[PDB]
Amino acid sequence: VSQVRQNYHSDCEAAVNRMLNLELYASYTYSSMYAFFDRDDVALHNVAEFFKENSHEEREHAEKFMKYQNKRGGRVVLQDIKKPERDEWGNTLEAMQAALQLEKTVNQALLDLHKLATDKVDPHLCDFLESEYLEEQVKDIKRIGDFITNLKRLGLPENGMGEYLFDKHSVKES
Amino acid sequence: VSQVRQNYHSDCEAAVNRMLNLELYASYTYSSMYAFFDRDDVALHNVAEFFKENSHEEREHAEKFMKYQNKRGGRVVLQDIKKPERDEWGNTLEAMQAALQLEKTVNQALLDLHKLATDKVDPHLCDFLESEYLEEQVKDIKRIGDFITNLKRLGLPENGMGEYLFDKHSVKES
Amino acid sequence: VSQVRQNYHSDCEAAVNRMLNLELYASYTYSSMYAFFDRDDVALHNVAEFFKENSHEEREHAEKFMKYQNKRGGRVVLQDIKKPERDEWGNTLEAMQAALQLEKTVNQALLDLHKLATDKVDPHLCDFLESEYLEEQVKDIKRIGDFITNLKRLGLPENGMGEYLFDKHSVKES
Amino acid sequence: VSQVRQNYHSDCEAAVNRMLNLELYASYTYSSMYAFFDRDDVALHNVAEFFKENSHEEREHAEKFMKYQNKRGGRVVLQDIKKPERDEWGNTLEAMQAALQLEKTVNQALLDLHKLATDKVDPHLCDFLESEYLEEQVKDIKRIGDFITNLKRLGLPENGMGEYLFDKHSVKES
Ligand SMILES: [Cl-]
Ligand SMILES: [Cl-]
Ligand SMILES: [Cl-]
Ligand SMILES: [Cl-]
Ligand SMILES: [Cl-]
Ligand SMILES: [Cl-]
Ligand SMILES: [Cl-]
Ligand SMILES: [Cl-]
Ligand SMILES: [Cl-]
Ligand SMILES: [Cl-]
Ligand SMILES: [Cl-]
Ligand SMILES: [Cl-]
Ligand SMILES: [Cl-]
Ligand SMILES: [Cl-]
Ligand SMILES: [Cl-]
Ligand SMILES: [Cl-]
Ligand SMILES: [Cl-]
Ligand SMILES: [Cl-]
Ligand SMILES: [Cl-]
Ligand SMILES: [Cl-]
Ligand SMILES: [Cl-]
Ligand SMILES: [Cl-]
Ligand SMILES: [Cl-]
Ligand SMILES: [Cl-]
Ligand SMILES: [Cl-]
Ligand SMILES: [Cl-]
Ligand SMILES: [Cl-]
Ligand SMILES: [Cl-]
Ligand SMILES: [Cl-]
Ligand SMILES: [Cl-]
Ligand SMILES: [Fe+2]
Ligand SMILES: [Fe+2]
Ligand SMILES: [Fe+2]
Ligand SMILES: [Fe+2]
Ligand SMILES: [Mg+2]
Ligand SMILES: [Mg+2]
Ligand SMILES: [Mg+2]
Ligand SMILES: [Mg+2]
Ligand SMILES: [Mg+2]
Ligand SMILES: [Mg+2]
Ligand SMILES: [Mg+2]
Ligand SMILES: [Mg+2]
Ligand SMILES: [Mg+2]
Ligand SMILES: [Mg+2]
Ligand SMILES: [Mg+2]
Ligand SMILES: [Mg+2]
Ligand SMILES: [Mg+2]
Ligand SMILES: [Mg+2]
Ligand SMILES: [Mg+2]
Ligand SMILES: [Mg+2]
Ligand SMILES: [Mg+2]
Ligand SMILES: [Mg+2]
Ligand SMILES: [Mg+2]
Ligand SMILES: [Mg+2]
Ligand SMILES: [Mg+2]
Ligand SMILES: [Mg+2]
Ligand SMILES: [Mg+2]
Ligand SMILES: [Mg+2]
Ligand SMILES: [Mg+2]
Ligand SMILES: [Mg+2]
Ligand SMILES: [Mg+2]
Ligand SMILES: [Mg+2]
Ligand SMILES: [Mg+2]
Ligand SMILES: [Mg+2]
Ligand SMILES: [Mg+2]
Ligand SMILES: [Mg+2]
Ligand SMILES: [Mg+2]
Ligand SMILES: [Mg+2]
Ligand SMILES: [Mg+2]
Ligand SMILES: [Mg+2]
Ligand SMILES: [Mg+2]
Ligand SMILES: [Mg+2]
């Protein structure tokens, strides 16, 4: 037993390692989307940079779980980071739809971890998820939903001018 | 009944007074450790100042419970502050081991108060503990554990040079 | 064929994807070393931060290969990022020995990619490796070798005081 | 023999003069594109200024070869600068397609000069091309490819609104 460990269930320790892996998986998927939108035959550079920034954020969220694990006296156990589901992402609408699904998958895992922490009467882990993860997820899901609504309004996937305008006006200039 | 009181159980009010007393007890123990490391035949002044600062923090945590009690319409009830368990603390390793135990005792009382607040359906008191106490405790327990690991690496209790180096490099210069 | 592609052999494109994966693998190994040295029963925080910074550098080196691939009209193809060889890294000497081996493995892959680029008469890829990768590798290998020499001088693995002093004086204060 | 000449083959000297001429030819083609987009019946002023800036860059690349020739003890020999292939450039897509072809023609001549320098064991000339020309060419080819992709997305040549928007958003405001 770690000398610091107190009120930290083995099941929560393991679930934190699985959550860590899912954050790294989400990072890697966003890396793939960055590289796709940077292709010369795609060439939507503000969209590419949006996904690159998301990739960096998800890696930071993984590192925060590593630090958390050690603060509680759990032990970080790493597994392979699986490659993303697709090698190419179609267009901005298809990519944003996949991003929405990914963000909801991550949110469901965080909610499931909160349920486990609640079951094991771990208020520190509940607070950590509520204070550091759950609101960020709701905000990022809302942002991507708003983007999808605007891509549909702009006539994606068929309307190339609409896709061009989204890259200029909806995502930050990079 | 206080005119402000709402959703505040008598049991929680009493447990807040007991928690207040334990914070003052923890403060007093850290005061004792300060005075010990300031002795001419101990003379580890950065270690002494670490414990003095901890003593001040624990007194602030007691005062925050006094303010909380009054905000909810409970009544502060004070009891004697018991003197610390020891009059002399051996060396930096023994003192840090006692500090780890003290911090885990305080953490267990905070977790027990959270369980009571949960049982009495008091989300304000749960939030107060999660937002103001529980993360501070995990961070301070981790810091002291890290210190103990380093004191053992430095050969305490026998290695006086190791103890000297810990005071110079591990705790803040004062 | 990409409209930008010129003098870029399929074999080099594939080898750039494999090199990308190895950079991500190296990043992940350094992440593991960070988390290990951050453990409460290891607690060498400057060593931990050295490895965390290395992890970030290797992720940047992967991203630079993604950008390169797209500049030449190749296509990024991602594979799983394999978990590191070890779950625990022993001590600062064992970790630095593994880091030296990792850096030499990465260097050998870069040298092998240079040989392939030379064989395929690709001076742009040769320049990219020489200007962005090969000197960084020699400098980082020299730094880790110097560290190993100093850890041995300090009596690792047995001399805990030596290990403590390395963390204070050899790696950047964090 | 020039007093400075060392390891500089007559064939490389002649090929540098031919490369100089091709840079001036590329400059002149970009000058023509500038004047076309500045016409009152074309009137895409940011596109015009993009090509004008390219024209100035290619003249600088010619001057750098003149300076190089003299540094090595070769002798600058000038030939006529041939007028561009077209007197009118159609529209932004046709012009960017011609620019891509021109940039790849210049790149192939630079790669051919690198092959000659390699054959004649001239590492200084190889370094000069790798350090001053080959990466610039890859970056500029990628930029023009990205532009063509976006012009096609915007519905060129038929979509005049798309062409108008490209001039406002894809090329620098002038
Ligand atoms: Cl526990
Ligand atoms: Cl508990
Ligand atoms: Cl357990
Ligand atoms: Cl696990
Ligand atoms: Cl796919
Ligand atoms: Cl998903
Ligand atoms: Cl949050
Ligand atoms: Cl605008
Ligand atoms: Cl009440
Ligand atoms: Cl109520
Ligand atoms: Cl009551
Ligand atoms: Cl009471
Ligand atoms: Cl005593
Ligand atoms: Cl205690
Ligand atoms: Cl807190
Ligand atoms: Cl090719
Ligand atoms: Cl070639
Ligand atoms: Cl090929
Ligand atoms: Cl591949
Ligand atoms: Cl292991
Ligand atoms: Cl290795
Ligand atoms: Cl380098
Ligand atoms: Cl010569
Ligand atoms: Cl020679
Ligand atoms: Cl000659
Ligand atoms: Cl000539
Ligand atoms: Cl014509
Ligand atoms: Cl041409
Ligand atoms: Cl260059
Ligand atoms: Cl607009
Ligand atoms: Fe995340
Ligand atoms: Fe306290
Ligand atoms: Fe690397
Ligand atoms: Fe040029
Ligand atoms: Mg232990
Ligand atoms: Mg377990
Ligand atoms: Mg998973
Ligand atoms: Mg698989
Ligand atoms: Mg919040
Ligand atoms: Mg955000
Ligand atoms: Mg996000
Ligand atoms: Mg918004
Ligand atoms: Mg269409
Ligand atoms: Mg009254
Ligand atoms: Mg009462
Ligand atoms: Mg008590
Ligand atoms: Mg007594
Ligand atoms: Mg907090
Ligand atoms: Mg603090
Ligand atoms: Mg404290
Ligand atoms: Mg620390
Ligand atoms: Mg002794
Ligand atoms: Mg094509
Ligand atoms: Mg191929
Ligand atoms: Mg590999
Ligand atoms: Mg495996
Ligand atoms: Mg070079
Ligand atoms: Mg260099
Ligand atoms: Mg460096
Ligand atoms: Mg490095
Ligand atoms: Mg050095
Ligand atoms: Mg020893
Ligand atoms: Mg002479
Ligand atoms: Mg000659
Ligand atoms: Mg010619
Ligand atoms: Mg003619
Ligand atoms: Mg070379
Ligand atoms: Mg360069
Ligand atoms: Mg430029
Ligand atoms: Mg150019
Ligand atoms: Mg660009
Ligand atoms: Mg039309």
- How far is the CA of C68 from the CAs of A44, B126, C129, D159, in angstroms? 17, 52, 11, 33
Cβ-Cβ contacts under 8 Å for B28 (sequence gap 6 or more): B55, B81, B82, B83, B84
Q: In whole angstroms, what is the distance from residue B46 CA to residue B149 CA?
A: 18
Chain B residues whose beta carbon lies within 8 Å of the beta carbon of residue C168: 169
- Cis status, amide bond into A157, omega within 30 of 0: yes
Could you tell me how many residues make up chain B?
A: 174
Name the minimum distance, in Å, from the CA of C153 to any CA of chain A: 30
Chain breaks in chain A (C to N over 2.5 A) after: none
- C74, C8 contact by CB (below 8 A): yes
DSSP for C97-133? HHHHHHHHHHHHHHHHHHHHHHHTT-HHHHHHHIIII
Q: In whole angstroms, what is the distance from residue D103 CA to residue D140 CA?
A: 8
Chain B residues whose beta carbon lies within 8 Å of the beta carbon of residue A123: 111, 114, 118, 126, 129-130, 134
Chain A residues whose beta carbon lies within 8 Å of the beta carbon of residue B107: 6-7
**Coil vs helix vs strand at A81:** strand
Q: Which amino acid is at C116?
A: L
Q: How many H helices and E strands in chain C?
A: 6, 0
- Tell which phi-psi region holds residue A90, choosing left (phi > 0), alpha (psi between -120 and 50) or beta: left
| D159–A163 CB contact, under 8 Å | no
Q: Which amino acid is at B76?
A: V
Domain with A131, as residue range(s), is 1-174
Q: How many domains does chain D have?
A: 1
- Tell which phi-psi region holds residue D163, choosing left (phi > 0), alpha (psi between -120 and 50) or beta: alpha
- C144, C96 contact by CB (below 8 A): yes
* Run of H or E including D55: helix D45-72
Ion ligand 33: residue ranges with CB closer than 5 A: C 23, 58, 61, 106
| Most distant CA pair in chain A, distance | 61
Question: Around C146, how many Cα atoms within 13 Å sit in the side-chain half-sphere?
Answer: 8
| D165–A161 CB contact, under 8 Å | yes
D149 has a chain A CB within 8 A of its CB: yes
- B155, C162 contact by CB (below 8 A): no
- How far is the CA of C159 from the CAs of B91, B171, C74, in angstroms? 21, 21, 51
A165 has a chain D CB within 8 A of its CB: yes
| A63–C31 CB contact, under 8 Å | yes
Rounded to 5 degrees, φ, ψ at D116 are: -65, -45
Cβ-Cβ contacts under 8 Å for D121 (sequence gap 6 or more): D7
| C41–B149 CB contact, under 8 Å | yes
Among A2, A3, A124, beta carbon nearest to B135: A124
- C171, C50 contact by CB (below 8 A): yes
Helix residue ranges, H only, chain B:
10-37, 45-72, 92-119, 123-129, 135-153, 160-169
Rounded to 5 degrees, φ, ψ at A124 are: -65, -45
Among D100, D134, D141, beta carbon nearest to C123: D134
- With contact defined as 3+ CB pairs under 8 Å, the chains touching B are A, C
Q: In whole angstroms, what is the distance from residue B28 CA to residue B23 CA?
A: 9
Which chain C residues in 36-75 lie under 8 Å from chain B, judged by CB atoms? 40-43, 45
| CATH code of the domain covering residue B89 | 1.20.1260.10
Q: Which amino acid is at D47?
A: V
Question: How far does the centroid of ligand 24 lie from the alpha carbon of residue D8, in Å?
Answer: 9
Exposure of C60 by Cβ count < 10 A (0-12 exposed, 13-18 middle, 19+ buried)? exposed
Residue of C93, C107, C124 lying closest to C19 (CA atoms): C107
Q: In whole angstroms, what is the distance from residue B89 CA to residue B110 CA?
A: 26
Q: In whole angstroms, what is the distance from residue D70 CA to residue B174 CA?
A: 66
Q: In whole angstroms, what is the distance from residue D14 CA to residue D8 CA?
A: 11
b/e burial code for range D54-76 (CB count within 10 A of at least 16 → b): bbeebbebbeebbebbeebebee
| A40–D154 CB contact, under 8 Å | no
Nearest ligand to the C-alpha of residue D26? 34
DSSP for D71-111? HHT--------PPPS-S---SHHHHHHHHHHHHHHHHHHHH
Residue D77 structure tokens: 């020999």
Rounded to 5 degrees, φ, ψ at A98 are: -65, -40
First to last CA, chain C: 48
Tell me, in Å, the resolution of the deposited structure.
1.2
**Coil vs helix vs strand at C13:** helix
Q: How many CB atoms neighbour CB A118 within 10 A?
A: 14
Q: Which amino acid is at B147?
A: F
**Residue B11 Cα to chain centre, angstroms:** 23
